[PDB]
Design a protein around this ligand. Structure first.
Ligand code: LEO
Ligand code: LEO
Ligand code: LEO
Ligand code: LEO
Lengths: 158, 158, 158, 158
């Protein structure tokens, strides 16, 4: 079941399909709150040539926008790059393919950098076990529970 | 004088201006020979917002093409990303700003990866000391002298 | 039922969803034959902000590639732009939303320009009436029947 | 001397080099005032493969940003496309190559469209004859003198 990019046994092809934003976390809370550049409502991941395509809605000024971004695979094992509100590097922390997928992102913009962790799921919501499991990883990565936000409880531009 | 991105004391702003391709090296020689995707003839580097712009000519099918690429700064110290003939990551190995600049690049395309090192200079040519100094770094990075090519001796789409 | 972009009554939002490549036509046949830059096997159209996203497979060197392109709406009524094997301009010639969609494209690359017409359908194939109807429009646009190719008869990277 | 894209005798290659923003005009004044998406301070035009590269500074929130945009040539004679604050189409209205260049742009964003005309010059300023000549063309294109702004009189992120 489980796989990671840092383990090399990740079959990226199975990540293709529909995904929903379940939980976001970051010690740069500003970024994941109402109007934050990172409060994304995932819709679909496309597996392309040495790249991943993301279709998602983001609410700007109270209005949902339809955005699409292409992330390119880099030479650093399991790493992907994407230009969005700065230079972003991310990796697939863990996934079971048919339920959840956990991404760990590092942003860079004007000298400063911050981390981001997201729990995208195949269903509009996931079991607490998973959300709890995610929460634990966020803390392990230095993200306090105050900066973990459950999006299933709010509007996700649906 | 000297500065590097891996030392953090790099003032990228001083890299702005005109640059010429002096020497290229790679153990994937195919890439740096006549018609190789990497046999680039640098012209100008633009320092932009969290990115670097490169204007260069590349000879395809005996015809010089005018190309421009934007590389984005990543969260990994001194690293930049650029999509060109695959996913590329590179860093400024060493520079004195007013004469030379040495770049170290790692390419990724369809599972395989190769290294590239270039000696871009502010004048159509550089002293042998420098070329020798570059050659030594290429070898230190596992690049044999047979794969170091002096472009000042050939046509550079000038 | 029927709508066009040149009639202004086109509800682009209904073009969202899955589409298949049924028939391609162009008097630059080279472009639509085995290995041609235009022999695309459509998969999905995404309606985005003032743009359209296309997910399609194209067979290069006997190997199917997963590609995604974003086309931007232009000020010229019903026109969209997309950079792919040159500068492309296209319009939705006709559509009934639930079955077929006909696109007319004009490519530009290195001084020369050529036309392209495609019949993308919601099912792996369409009735002959439609294919015949398409064929007639291709001829009206100066495309001879020899340059109209039925892709349902060949491999479409499925 | 004089040439236009609508006359087909335009040698785009001679537009390569440094350019300064002399005068901007638009009946969507909001766009060309302090903080307007169109109040651009041109720096350099790069002639590339079926495209034009623009390096310019734009003052956002009192801070000058370094931006670079690539515009692609389209099949419509003399027309170029560029995605910036919407879909843009533009043409070179008139130029003498060594002094001035006049661009006419049409923007499209969320159903609405507006025109823009710019007088980019090779020197920090141009003779009144030229500015007057430009002003006249702006009026001919329905742009009133109140919406013509002389940038040489203000800060141009220099
Ligand atoms: C990392 C991801 C899965 C993508 C790209 C980066 C961002 C801001 O998080 C959104 C979706
Ligand atoms: C690395 C660089 C300086 C740029 C981008 C990558 C490539 C292939 O080397 C050319 C110029
Ligand atoms: C025109 C389209 C529908 C898209 C974009 C252009 C191209 C080459 O035809 C493919 C798919
Ligand atoms: C049209 C141009 C010359 C370029 C691109 C469009 C814009 C907003 O005007 C700036 C510079």
């Amino acid at each position: 079941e489980e796989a990671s990019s840092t383990r090399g046994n990740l079959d990226v092809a199975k990540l293709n399909g529909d995904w929903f934003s379940i939980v976001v976390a970051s010690n740069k809370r500003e970024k994941i709150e109402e109007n934050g550049s990172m409060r994304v409502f995932m819709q679909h991941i496309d597996v392309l040539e040495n790249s991943l395509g993301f279709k998602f809605r983001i609410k700007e000024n109270g209005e949902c926008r339809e955005l699409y971004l292409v992330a390119y695979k880099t030479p650093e094992d399991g790493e992907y790059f994407v230009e969005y509100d700065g230079g972003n590097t991310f990796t697939i922390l863990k996934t079971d393919y048919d339920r959840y997928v956990m991404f760990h992102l590092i942003n860079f913009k004007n000298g400063e950098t911050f981390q981001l962790m997201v729990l995208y799921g195949r269903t509009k919501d996931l079991s607490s076990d998973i959300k709890e499991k995610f929460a634990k990883l966020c803390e392990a990565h230095g993200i306090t529970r105050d900066n973990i936000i459950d999006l299933t409880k709010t509007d996700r531009c649906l």
